[PDB]
């Protein structure tokens, strides 16, 4: 439910150690949580709202130019003037020009001319700025339940750095104390909220100041005084004489292609509503009751409807409707190996399954985590108990290798935040955030700023230095760096 | 002394971060009693718990009488990222401050 089949989901399970945990829940994933006791809950990021913004610059991606004046003085008296200069709205450049005899100017010797033109721009790129506070994370979380696909179960939590603690009601389940952090996630206050025509996306305080276009200086309305203005024009003098000026038209596509590194942000409005996003929440169980443990278990036929299926992470949903009994009864979920002895084998995801009863509605749908071999999934009670063959078909060392690769991507994206992703009580974890904190920080410090081919290339330059000469020390650390870069391009390949 | 002074707290302004390693907070205290005293903590752990860092202002106190009296408090969070805590044993608003370095 709410989680199954996102292909990015991740399981996290605490080993008592009190209720502690803490999982970096990340937009695009849904993190599911299971405990010894307790129900099991699914949490995913949903939408990250940036509430209040304030304007910095605008620029312009499409020029247009008005009348063109001239004002050419002869070789004697030099500089020209052109009263339409000395405005905000007229751009000018002096270009000493050909003009000896034939036409005024009783000497040779060139003679300046001032030709200017009026710059009024068509559209605005309007960069907006955000600061980490007042942004709003909205996380929705759902527990596994009878609901099959049609609410004491899923709760809606919105976590503001003005309220980093959150505690969500679940009637007959528990609180799910959420201590989130709405600040450290994305490195905001670097990102600016950038608006081309009717689109929006975030870019860095470095890229947004460095674009060479007209400035609006964050000005309001009126007839904005445009800084620069020169970079967008084109003063060219044909052969020696008659300077001409051209508009050099809309660059909208040019910023678009120059913008390859940004993430796009969905909406605008009174509030910028963006996507992706990165949160580290300290998830706190404290109050969760299973609510089913007191029920009777019900003896009745069970009839699958949707035949069970294998999710990408390997967990298997199975939907069971059944008539014939009443009461909000438990149902036996144990999967088995021999049909003879049940001998429950394989961990169950749904913890305690139950039923809403009412009439012959049923519909639970609990989901399971079968062993790496062949397995019979048996939902049933007495002699007539309905089963399904399974054959998970993934190897165990395959799963371990899987969780490692996956671990390496979480470690590649979240940087130093990988460590503490599923933190708990061990200290060696703090040593991790420390050790990868200093290598991470100094790594991003000297490099940072490295494009795809930059890091692939310098990756192999470091690996050819990896095995080129001398000692087993520096060659070793160069080979290590090269490993990290190449590995960092390889990751995020899709 | 002033007991510890207990009632609701609502952050007036989103608090601030000075350039000299400080966080400044204003609080309403939702109107209970006179010249009482309300604590605050910098808590790395849980909502509150252990106190780390240091209060640059000392003996943070409510002034007097009706509804809201704002207590502005110079606080230096630890070099990490904590959760300002306003002081009610239970009902309290909080934050997350990510001081740098």
């Amino acid at each position, epitope marked *: 439910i709410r989680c199954i089949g996102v292909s990015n989901r991740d399981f996290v399970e605490g080993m008592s150690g009190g209720t502690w945990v803490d999982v970096v829940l990340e937009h695009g994933g849904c993190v599911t949580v299971m405990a010894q006791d307790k129900p099991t809950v699914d949490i995913e990021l949903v939408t990250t709202t940036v509430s*209040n913004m*304030a*304007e910095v610059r605008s620029y312009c991606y499409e020029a247009s130019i008005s009348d063109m004046a001239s004002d050419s003085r002869c070789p004697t008296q030099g500089e020209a003037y052109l009263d339409k200069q000395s405005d905000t709205q007229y751009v000018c450049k002096r270009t000493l020009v050909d003009r000896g005899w034939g036409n005024g100017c009783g000497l040779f010797g060139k003679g300046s001319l001032v030709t200017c033109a009026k710059f009024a721009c068509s559209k605005k790129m309007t960069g907006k700025s955000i600061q980490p506070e007042n942004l709003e994370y909205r996380i929705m979380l759902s527990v596994h339940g009878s609901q099959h696909s049609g609410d004491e179960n899923r709760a809606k939590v919105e976590i503001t750095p003005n309220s980093p603690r959150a505690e969500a009601t679940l009637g007959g389940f528990g609180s799910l104390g959420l201590d989130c952090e709405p600040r450290t996630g994305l490195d905001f206050s670097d990102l600016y909220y950038l608006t081309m025509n009717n689109k929006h996306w975030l870019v860095h305080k470095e890229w947004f100041h460095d674009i060479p276009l007209p400035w609006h200086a964050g000005a309001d309305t009126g007839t904005p005084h445009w800084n620069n203005k020169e970079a967008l024009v084109e003063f060219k003098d044909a052969h020696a004489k008659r300077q001409t000026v051209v508009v050099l038209g809309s660059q909208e596509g040019a910023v678009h292609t120059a913008l390859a590194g940004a993430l796009e942000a969905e909406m605008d409005g009174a509030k910028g509503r963006l996507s992706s996003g990165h949160l580290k929440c300290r998830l706190k169980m404290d109050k969760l009751r299973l609510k089913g443990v007191s029920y009777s278990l019900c003896t009745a036929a069970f009839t699958f409807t949707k035949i069970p299926a294998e999710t990408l992470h390997g967990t298997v949903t199975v939907e069971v409707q059944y008539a014939g009994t009443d009461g909000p009864c438990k149902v036996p979920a144990q999967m088995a190996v021999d049909m003879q002895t049940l001998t429950p084998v394989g961990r169950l995801i749904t913890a305690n399954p139950v039923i809403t009863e009412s009439t012959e509605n049923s519909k639970m749908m609990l989901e399971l985590d079968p062993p790496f071999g062949d397995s019979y999934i048996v939902i049933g009670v007495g002699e007539k108990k309905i089963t399904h063959h399974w054959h998970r078909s993934g190897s165990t060392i395959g799963k371990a290798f899987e969780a490692t690769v996956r671990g390496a991507k979480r470690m590649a994206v979240l940087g130093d935040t990988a460590w503490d992703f599923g933190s708990v009580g061990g200290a060696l974890n703090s040593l991790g955030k420390g050790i990868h904190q200093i290598f991470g920080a100094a790594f991003k410090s000297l490099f940072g700023g490295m494009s795809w081919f930059s890091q692939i290339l310098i990756g192999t330059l470091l690996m050819w230095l990896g095995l080129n000469t001398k000692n087993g020390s520096i060659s070793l650390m160069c080979l290590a760096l090269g490993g990290v870069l190449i590995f960092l391009s390889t990751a995020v390949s899709a | 002394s002033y007991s510890l002074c207990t009632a609701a707290f609502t952050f*007036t*302004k989103i608090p601030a971060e000075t350039l000299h390693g400080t966080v400044t907070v204003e609080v309403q205290y939702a109107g209970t009693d006179g010249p009482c005293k309300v604590p605050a903590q910098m808590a790395v752990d849980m909502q509150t718990l252990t106190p780390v860092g240091r209060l640059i202002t000392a003996n943070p106190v409510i002034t007097e009488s009706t509804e*809201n009296s*704002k207590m502005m408090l110079e606080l230096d969070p630890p070099f990490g990222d904590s959760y300002i805590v306003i002081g009610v044993g239970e009902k309290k608003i909080t934050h997350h401050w990510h001081r740098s370095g």
Partner: antibody
Amino acid sequence: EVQLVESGAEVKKPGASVKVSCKASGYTFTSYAMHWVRQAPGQRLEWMGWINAGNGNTKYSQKFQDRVTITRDTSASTAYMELSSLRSEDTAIYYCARDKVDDYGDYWFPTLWYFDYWGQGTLVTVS
Amino acid sequence: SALTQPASVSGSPGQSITISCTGTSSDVGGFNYVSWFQQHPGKAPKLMLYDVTSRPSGVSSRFSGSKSGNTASLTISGLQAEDEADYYCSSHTSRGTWVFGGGTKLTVL
């Protein structure tokens, strides 16, 4: 307590010049201040003020950037706003209020509060 | 300029009123400067704001200020009835001049 009062009800011909006095009483005309806020009944308060009684500086709303000039004198602890070339439109009430200057005596950024007190009011009407 | 403020309003005693003043980024948005000035008709205006949320000491704790984006909201509850004083919102602009909103005639029924 803090007391400000000024010239009483007064009338001027169109094109005349009003001179209103603000006599500050009950506080220290030190980290002074004063303002001038025009009001007649039924419209928006305009603020055409000035802001500095220590140094005698002034800032005017462009609105009336050059019309009013202001004299400030501690011996009488009094600020005199004088609006020259008044018009039928200006018939109004001119309050003088204060917003305390900062320690340095230079007034740039106000107190977070502005007007903790107000003049008595002077109704000025144009024929 | 001319702070947008709506002409006039009313309601049962004790009932919440909110008068919202809408400025621009030049003044109300990019500053904490706000003031709501209770002006008794016939008498001199007074203070009933100070740096938004806070209040001068002689203020009926009734009053409450708030701000979002470009807004100034004076929200009053627990009305004592005799508290309709034309409410004017005023703030310090960025240019260094003060502007007073259109004012709200307050209607006590």
